[PDB]
Amino acid sequence: MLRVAVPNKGALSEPATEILAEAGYRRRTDSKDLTVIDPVNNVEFFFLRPKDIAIYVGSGELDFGITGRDLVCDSGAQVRERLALGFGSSSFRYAAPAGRNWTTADLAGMRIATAYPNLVRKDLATKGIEATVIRLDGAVEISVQLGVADAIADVVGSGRTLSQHDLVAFGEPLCDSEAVLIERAEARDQLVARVQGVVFGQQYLMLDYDCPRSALKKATAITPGLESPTIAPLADPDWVAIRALVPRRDVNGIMDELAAIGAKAILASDIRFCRF
Amino acid sequence: MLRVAVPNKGALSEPATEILAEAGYRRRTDSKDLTVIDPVNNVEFFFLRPKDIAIYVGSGELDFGITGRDLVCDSGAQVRERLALGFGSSSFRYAAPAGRNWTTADLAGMRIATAYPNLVRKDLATKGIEATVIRLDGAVEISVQLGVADAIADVVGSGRTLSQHDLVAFGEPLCDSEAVLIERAEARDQLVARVQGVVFGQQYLMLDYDCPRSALKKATAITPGLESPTIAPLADPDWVAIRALVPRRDVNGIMDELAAIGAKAILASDIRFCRF
Ligand SMILES: Nc1ncnc2c1ncn2[C@@H]1O[C@H](COP(=O)(O)O)[C@@H](O)[C@H]1O
Ligand SMILES: Nc1ncnc2c1ncn2[C@@H]1O[C@H](COP(=O)(O)O)[C@@H](O)[C@H]1O
């Protein structure tokens, strides 16, 4: 029996639910229900406050959780980070009023507002800088305008929020975060393998294309696949169909290369999961 | 120019907006806008995270805030509590698995989950009890079931949430909370007076009733009003109309008493605000 924590709301919740569904686990279909019992897989899913997931895994009975690396860092929980899941990427930055040459040294003795004060205190300590870290619940940007803080430390996605409050990021990031599968410090191995199959498989597309036999050597070099491309005859003896897994991020350039050597009906399909 | 913080969401937000509107301040009509400029009254309203209001008032440029007494306590902010506003009442309690004789002494060495850890640590210190306080973002009840904590400390309204998670409250309350108007440690006096007028006035109804002249002494004793009841003749010389402010909570018993001495057309009306 495994117990897995999943963010109940926020930007990580849907993608986390999707990755688990993709791995074959039962979905939360009625969204107002905080628990999902998966008899088939013998897993119980608990839909918890995003901020709290790491504590539940590190100090509770939960075997795994999906949450953000920054939140794990801020929680102080001792958990194993097993996989980065391919969503929820962001960078955590210090920021202060725009138009000034803020650098890390300026942080000394500042009041720094943040919703991740442990993460911020640890970063300052590493830098050898003393400052006054002020915990806020969120929406931290407005704290500078309203006189609570001199600077902030917060998640930076597009950077839109900072610009909207006339703030500019400075310094190296405090954390480069991504959603992660964390495990409490055979059943467990199965779940990690299944989630890994989705993480890995979502990076590829399956490419199928018709190729003239005269172009087969060239095509084989363009799409080597994970082991070696699959080659099957067409009814027309002068042609074959080739199948190869290709990185999702290179598929267009690959299609262009194949078209240039005479490939036809070049198509891509999604895969659910893949074990190398 | 005054700056006032108002909860942007949660159970205190609507009543806080209403009390300010009742006091004559400009309403937030477009709810998605975090600021409201009130040129007429020279007040700017900032709609902030409920948890953060006390820090903004205590350490920021905000002159006042409406928030909960428990949140002020947990914030550690040094602010003046000027008025209790008549809404948001609750009690903060320790709770643990139902069916057992939990008492305060049992808390020693326990892991106690709560979203108000400062409030809880101060209460434990007063009691001379050491324990491990675990900060959670909210939805703390499930923490006992999931093995993160032995007990919780949380707001108790109806008590429904505790019962739903098989928990029972024990011990004296850690705080008896209510929504409050807090001020940073002539313009300010005006705002307090105006909010006070609403707080005070909302406790009364204005009662008007027709009364036979033969019953006037008895009626006067039943409704003495705040100074003395207003008495005005009706067109019918054998009658008068009496007006008196009466506590909202006693109005029905008062109406019964008046009806028993022959009063007719006994009615109550709301008032907006009242200065004693
Ligand atoms: N704590 C967070 N965890 C994951 N993504 C976030 C977080 N905070 C902000 N983002 C994302 O960052 C994107 C834009 O970044 P920004 O304009 O800097 O706020 C938004 O679409 C958010 O979904
Ligand atoms: N932090 C809070 N501040 C003000 N009211 C609250 C708070 N938490 C819960 N309540 C109220 O308490 C009521 C019911 O209490 P309970 O079943 O004990 O959760 C709910 O209708 C809530 O609006």
UniProtKB/Swiss-Prot annotation, chains A, B:
It catalyses: 1-(5-phospho-beta-D-ribosyl)-ATP + diphosphate = 5-phospho-alpha-D-ribose 1-diphosphate + ATP. One of its GO terms (molecular function) is AMP binding. The keyword Thylakoid does not apply. It is found in: Cytoplasm. It comes from Mycobacterium tuberculosis (strain ATCC 25618 / H37Rv). PROSITE patterns: ATP_P_PHORIBOSYLTR (PS01316). GO terms for cellular component: cytoplasm; plasma membrane. Pathway: Amino-acid biosynthesis; L-histidine biosynthesis; L-histidine from 5-phospho-alpha-D-ribose 1-diphosphate: step 1/9. This is ATP phosphoribosyltransferase. CDD domains: PBP2_HisGL1. InterPro entries: ATP-PRT_HisG_long, ATP_PRibTrfase_cat, ATP_PRibTrfase_CS, ATP_PRibTrfase_HisG, HisG_C, N-reg_PII-like_a/b, N-reg_PII/ATP_PRibTrfase_C. Belongs to the ATP phosphoribosyltransferase family. Long subfamily. It is an enzyme of class 2 (transferase). It comes from the Bacteria. Catalyzes the condensation of ATP and 5-phosphoribose 1-diphosphate to form N'-(5'-phosphoribosyl)-ATP (PR-ATP). Has a crucial role in the pathway because the rate of histidine biosynthesis seems to be controlled primarily by regulation of HisG enzymatic activity. The keyword Magnesium applies. Equilibrium between an active dimeric form, an inactive hexameric form and higher aggregates. Interconversion between the various forms is largely reversible and is influenced by the natural substrates and inhibitors of the enzyme. GO terms for biological process: L-histidine biosynthetic process. Its EC number is 2.4.2.17. Keywords: Amino-acid biosynthesis, ATP-binding, Cytoplasm, Glycosyltransferase, Histidine biosynthesis, Magnesium, Metal-binding, Nucleotide-binding, Transferase.
